[PDB]
Amino acid sequence: MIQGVIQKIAGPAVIAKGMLGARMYDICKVGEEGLVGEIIRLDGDTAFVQVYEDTSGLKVGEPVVSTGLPLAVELGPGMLNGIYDGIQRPLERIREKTGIYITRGVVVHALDREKKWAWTPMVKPGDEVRGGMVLGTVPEFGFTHKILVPPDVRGRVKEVKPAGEYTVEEPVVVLEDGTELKMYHTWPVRRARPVQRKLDPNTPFLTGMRILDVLFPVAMGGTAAIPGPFGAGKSVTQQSLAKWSNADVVVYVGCGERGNEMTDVLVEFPELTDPKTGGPLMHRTVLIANTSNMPVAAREASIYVGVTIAEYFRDQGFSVALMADSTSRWAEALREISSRLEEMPAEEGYPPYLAARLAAFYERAGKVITLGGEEGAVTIVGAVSPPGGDMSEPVTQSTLRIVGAFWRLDASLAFRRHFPAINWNGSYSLFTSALDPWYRENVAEDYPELRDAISELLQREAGLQEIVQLVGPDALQDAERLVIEVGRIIREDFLQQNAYHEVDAYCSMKKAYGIMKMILAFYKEAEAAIKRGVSIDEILQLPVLERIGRARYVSEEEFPAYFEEAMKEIQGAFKALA
């Protein structure tokens, strides 16, 4: 390998000499302590290496050795149930080794090299293999972990290991040319993994919340953004997404949050239980945690590590959900790095290439055809935490130009005890028109029109709030009071949803469709009743109202009977009662 010495130290920058032949953006080790660094500039026999950690105590003349490969991750069995820092270092082993502090220069391996896995071969000698094919199967927490040939490896199989207990490191399949395939490979975090073809997103991502699914839906392989105001339930919403989503595997990325927030998200998850099996939820998740005092390079590489791991699990044929705790902190780290290199600031100090990086990160998501021929998808949800909540900030503006959905959280509804506190104004989704055929084929042929009617009702309710503030609800016309009561009914019976209820936390599409049909039927019959002469305050006490309000909290298998009973009571109640 390329070996050299230090000739100049100045802050986090180290200037090496004797490094003729090193490659750009490779990982290098500096000094006897072996601090990891990245080569950012080459000139003559001199390479500029950027140290990740602190450089106090280093001296001129200490050796520098280059690994010859860029920043990458280890992909294979053992990633699930794990907690990693920005560059995929298991924090648990670090605590077991060096105690409660994180000393400079700790060396740990991403995948446990000692654990035994039960091998199950799938290929036979003489078969032709090509990047993306499946070689075997390993069980892991109820998942059949498929060992995949690395994408660039192609050849014909010579020998295969028989079924049994083996470690991660053991070579399992050896090809004709002598190349050996083991249970893991390595892949650069800044280069996307190849796929056969990107299928356009035509199926919805059932988030488990009515407002999200019905009014601002996101398709599988789509992207969404969400602000992070205090006391607004962002943590609870993300927790519910992880718990009740359609996704097979969950990847959570924390990229520079406060210490206490990271402590909370690391303590609460292990006590949760996913509803599908009742086992620990942590079995399906990978935690990447980064605090504010960690090195900047790890905070910058965290999202790349997370999305690469998600892409790997997608290549296995699953569906993965990816969450970024705050892309604002990642943008802050990028700005700091850009300031270190004395790059010319573009706007408010952000480098001009911020939008390119954001688009590149957000574009990895999608529903694809894997190289092995199966189907997979990655869904990315990104949180943006602007300085003063101003959405004219460049990071939010660049994010808005590529995401397909925007879920504007607000603390006003949270103060008003409305949960989730997602405003129906300002929030928008671009997948509705594309997802219309799926809705027509699956849930109902008139579901989109029902949703549009609900939207029109909410818009009309918002369209007369000025008189309510000026005068009040009691002194209103019959139609206006009916409309405001309809809006309140919608808010308190379809948009509000409790995530702590054993049966009300999750709501399928058909339940919401039934709720909307019932509300529309009630509203139409109320219009007809007033047209034939009735007072609204008489309608305020119809039993069908308390029936619709109690339409929640029922089991899904109990729903259709409840729906038919409610519809019949609606039809008979507006005729027997004026």
Partner: protein, 470 residues
Amino acid sequence: KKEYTGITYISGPLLFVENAKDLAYGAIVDIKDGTGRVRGGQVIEVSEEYAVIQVFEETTGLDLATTSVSLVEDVARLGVSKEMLGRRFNGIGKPIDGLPPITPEKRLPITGLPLNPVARRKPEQFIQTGISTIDVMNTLVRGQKLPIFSGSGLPANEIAAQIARQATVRPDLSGEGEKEEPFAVVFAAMGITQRELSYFIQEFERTGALSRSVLFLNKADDPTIERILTPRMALTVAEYLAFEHDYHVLVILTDMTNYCEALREIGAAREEIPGRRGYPGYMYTDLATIYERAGVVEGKKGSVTQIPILSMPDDDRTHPIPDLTGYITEGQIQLSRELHRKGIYPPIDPLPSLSRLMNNGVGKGKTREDHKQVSDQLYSAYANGVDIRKLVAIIGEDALTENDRRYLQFADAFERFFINQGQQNRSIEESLQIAWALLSMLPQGELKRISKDHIGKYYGQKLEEIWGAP
């Protein structure tokens, strides 16, 4: 004794020395001139041709022919021991109380290591400060980072001194495990003047709080790098005490704006390109390396709690310093200029204040069972009365509804009794009694935020501030 001569360049705070390969990056060196005077310096760049040294103090007498440079440490270290309590230092570990130097148990790097996130645990217990506006409405939890936002002329120093004098733990209300652990206060002051130094010394001596506290004091005329190093020294001592002798430590950092300006001067002296608004681009990470040294650790009983104090330059919360601090910390305590001018001390304005960990350190088992509800009701009622005060000036007192007169009286009595507590020390129970007495003025049934049993237990009491709340 290895000392280098052969200075080749002296300008500003920087001097260049040749044949200095053996000097490690960041080492502290001693500069001696022809008169025998000794100056301090720190190595900021090492290369094959020369090493760059930043001089602590002025360079008036230096010359290229007689100057010599010698090493002190490869890296800055502080000698620590449990016998530091009751001593004063000048920000680099040199005593200034005239007492003999201490005997170090160990020498530690002042740039502490980061904490492993998986080794942390959630804060669960509170610290009694003696201020009703702080304990009742914005409770401070052990392991929190709760800054105080002050203005230009507001008395932040007096508030800091009072909190340091009165802060204590309450094992009594723990219910179970009722036993005390030793409590210590680490007081770091940066960029203070002579008047403030004298005031702090007198306040910490007169009452006897000195023996339970460690002081790191750095004046305004002192070298900038000492101001930079002071908070790291204080945090090193705090970490050592808390995680080696199971102490409960409270760290008070004064005038973080002085630290930011010292950082700006240092960064400019290294010829680094400034970031936005003239501050270095690494300011966020630099501040994080200070704030994030607080918390609690699984398997250990100690704890560290920080109260940064920073004066908002133009009363602007969009200034980078308070902005980054709000990013890193868990709330803020806001001082009001109106309350200060009206004669109320401490001038803490409850409306713009917040504690982001309050809900987890209060309640049954930790404090009185009705803490959070009382705080919520007080907040709502005060916010309601504030706008009625403004409406009165235009519509008149006579056109008020009966409820609004009660709200006015509640706001005025709240300002006169709850906030305006003066110098006296209030226990949590006494503050709660005062709060219930104030809430009694509002009609029963308007207390929408309070459960009925709590109202039944504690409603119906006249003013206890005059009584002293027996």
